[PDB]
Design a protein around this ligand. Sequence first.
Ligand SMILES: *[C@@H]1O[C@H](CO)[C@@H](O)[C@H](O)[C@H]1NC(C)=O
Ligand SMILES: *[C@@H]1O[C@H](CO)[C@@H](O)[C@H](O)[C@H]1NC(C)=O
Ligand SMILES: N[C@@H](CCC(=O)O)C(=O)O
Ligand SMILES: N[C@@H](CCC(=O)O)C(=O)O
Lengths: 514, 512
Amino acid sequence: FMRREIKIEGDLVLGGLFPINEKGTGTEECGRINEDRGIQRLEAMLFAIDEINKDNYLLPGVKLGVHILDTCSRDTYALEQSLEFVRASLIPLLIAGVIGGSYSSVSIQVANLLRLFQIPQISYASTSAKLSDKSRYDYFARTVPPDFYQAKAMAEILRFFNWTYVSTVASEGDYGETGIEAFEQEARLRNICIATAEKVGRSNIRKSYDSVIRELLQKPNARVVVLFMRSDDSRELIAAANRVNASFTWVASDGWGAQESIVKGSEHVAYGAITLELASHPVRQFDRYFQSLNPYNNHRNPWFRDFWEQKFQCSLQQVCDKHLAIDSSNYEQESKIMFVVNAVYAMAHALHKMQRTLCPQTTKLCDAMKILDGKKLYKEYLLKIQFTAPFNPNKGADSIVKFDTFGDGMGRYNVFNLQQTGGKYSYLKVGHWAETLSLDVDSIHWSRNSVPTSQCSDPCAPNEMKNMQPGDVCCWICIPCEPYEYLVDEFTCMDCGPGQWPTADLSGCYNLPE
Amino acid sequence: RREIKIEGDLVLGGLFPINEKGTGTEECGRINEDRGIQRLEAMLFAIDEINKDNYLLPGVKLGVHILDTCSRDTYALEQSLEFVRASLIPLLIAGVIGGSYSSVSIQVANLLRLFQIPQISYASTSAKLSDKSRYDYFARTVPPDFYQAKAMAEILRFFNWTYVSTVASEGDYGETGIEAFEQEARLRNICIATAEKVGRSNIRKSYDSVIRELLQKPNARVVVLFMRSDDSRELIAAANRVNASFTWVASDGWGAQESIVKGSEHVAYGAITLELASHPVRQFDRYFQSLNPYNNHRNPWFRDFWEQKFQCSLQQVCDKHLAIDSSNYEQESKIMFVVNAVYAMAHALHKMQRTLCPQTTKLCDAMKILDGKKLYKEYLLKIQFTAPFNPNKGADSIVKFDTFGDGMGRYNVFNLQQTGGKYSYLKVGHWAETLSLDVDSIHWSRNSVPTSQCSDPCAPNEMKNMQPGDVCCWICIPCEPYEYLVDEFTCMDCGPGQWPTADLSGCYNLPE
Ligand SMILES: *[C@@H]1O[C@H](CO)[C@@H](O)[C@H](O)[C@H]1NC(C)=O
Ligand SMILES: *[C@@H]1O[C@H](CO)[C@@H](O)[C@H](O)[C@H]1NC(C)=O
Ligand SMILES: N[C@@H](CCC(=O)O)C(=O)O
Ligand SMILES: N[C@@H](CCC(=O)O)C(=O)O
């Protein structure tokens, strides 16, 4: 009966799309609140707009409004909601540009719609490589990189610890499939074999997941499982492994990232997991803003109440303590917030340079810009380069926001390790990827305190077996050697020669008596 | 804000260029009588018949939501939003019938695929639409211009017109259509004197400027046209002003439309045009001619249509006895395709209803929310005998689709004549896989089979043919009096004691 949205008027309006709510189960379209990647990212856009509307050097004279909608983590729903943005170009607010899409599937479908009406779009989290194709997504840009690189970071980590036999499980969609396709290619090149390639997807219940765990279990040697899955899917997969108490060493992409909500209730099954996330740094000023929010002062966000009640397990009108508050003990800035803020700022800077150009006499939205030329805006937005919203210290660690010729951001990632040292589970940065892998292996805590072994065949017996490679470079057979042969090396048996005999160790030959 | 909204258990959207493109600031202009109104009524006709048919969708009444595209892709696209807001007063759309201009069908297709809504065009011929990776919910009852271009090039190659000029409409129809021609041209050693093109928001001047430029290539007397209907009309009028005269070879955009040459009949005389191979739907003639402002209130565009066709007014008032009849009406060439497009959609839904609703003829719950993807990949396999409105079944009168969702590449060639004081299009041939036409029935511009070559033919008595750098133009070199033409391009000394024959084909001995 009621479909929520945020509508704030302005001289120029920016549309927004966030997975405020998780996907609905069964017949319902929306489910529980997505606390970190939903509410936080939403308020980070509101935070950016407020800051911009108080900035005298950026769009002074032009107030930015917004029209933020919920995607409910589903491309189809996001798509239906976005129709709201195009009808406006005919109560309805004219959309200068759209900020959003977290899931690549929604960003892509939304992009297919938006280009039809020349509406620029900037995503702050969609990493699918498909989105780099300017012949299909010509009005799309993003402040994050294409998984073309993330897939390399993952394959190079496996190649490092010599994990040549692994299983993979990808989410159906443009994120999981294209991302896993990239990995497979990077794997072949580095002689890494895939034991079993699984995949879950749309409208999947426990059984589809339990069925995946079972199939992973049918490849016991492949103890390292490469994941390229959506957040929600990852959560389901780990819950499935927790039931049958299965245990593997997970290598997950940003979809999983450094989210604690993913492993909650199955912390021991995900212990030792290694995950990736886009290299970013918290926006300090945002921490202050978000923590100051509460059901009393934050009425413009129609999802905040539901949020509040779920985060604290509340109720208003077990009632809730009017003294609750978001703080350093219960809140941690979502990993990609920086990208949301930069996205909004990039659109503002683009509009700002356009207004300086077409309206040389005032700071106001002059007649020449009453009807925006979206095509020009995009080909004015692509060439944008600016120092990251003030909320970023220094400027030496290349803190400039700009875009590739494909409209992408820079491929930089951080590697994380799920630890628990202090009784509580948390992610610890254990490395990073810029162009080459980098990580200090010593700070890594593994599953079962031993650096995993993930190879095709069982190791050869010492006392007499030689390692033999068939046709591939992942599997082998062990050939016991003749009692008179020793192991010159791991794969070769050689006759000790007359008068000599192999040592018990088989490392050499000793002289025979008698 | 006009439209046709008729409720039903299942609804089909429709798009037709009811109105011409608006000039300047206006979005819509005059009524498009044949390609707009007739085609629109043909869908209404088809829907009525299907609703009286006990063997096709019995128990499931088909309704419609028909909109005007005003011959513009952007306008059609905005209108089409109506079709998708529905899947959220608004009628849910099972499928869309339409797009005449390829540019509107393309843009509409990019929107419809996003909501898995199948679309069947009855006239959009662009080869682009065959790409199923881009237009995966699009199908059509007509073939791609990949073939039409071949038909045109082979016609030129036949009469040896190796030097021609081309003018194409800007847009997905003219540009891709002309590109295909150019390729087919090179392969048959046909050169393009000058490639012209008109387009969006073009006034007289742009066209006048094209005629001048065509005139700057006098040898190229044959001009190939791959233009929209409206653009063609503009180009012909322009030629009429400066009384220019060429032999036109136009694609179906022009087709067999008399409205294109009205007021410039003498300028287009002898023109050769193409149109998809089709036959009139007889039962449709009865239906259309029975329509009048008194009995046709469901078509909100009919009154304007009536007033323009008869130069009327209601409330020079109009004779209450006017009628659409055999002396002022002729079935539009593509009506058949419109009717078959609707029936194809109907047959697809019917098969789906038999499959998901095995126990009743009604739209059961299982089909409450249609799976458009399945529908499209259940419509592509459809094969049926053309709506009853087609005699025989031997002349392959079955409707079905390519793997690309296209129809069969069959065209007819027409010649604009005037023999009986009045101007008309006579069928002078056709193209199925190879060209075919009886050259004797063709009337040319200036009673002489046109000559369109780069250079003038060489004198016999002594000139040899010499090719410069290209393969279309040449110069003529007279031979020395003692040389003969071993062949068309080579003079050769008859040698001592000999001399060339009067005809220069050989050498004879000298006396004395
Ligand atoms: C990977 O294998 C190579 C070759 O056997 C070995 O030198 C290297 O130490 C291994 N890396 C690790 C840390 O397992
Ligand atoms: C040139 O065209 C004429 C007319 O159809 C035809 O009779 C003749 O054979 C053609 N000659 C060539 C070059 O093939
Ligand atoms: N990179 C993921 C989104 C992850 C996120 O929302 O943080 C995608 O492209 O679907
Ligand atoms: N074949 C033309 C349409 C001609 C017609 O409407 O009959 C096109 O694709 O633009």
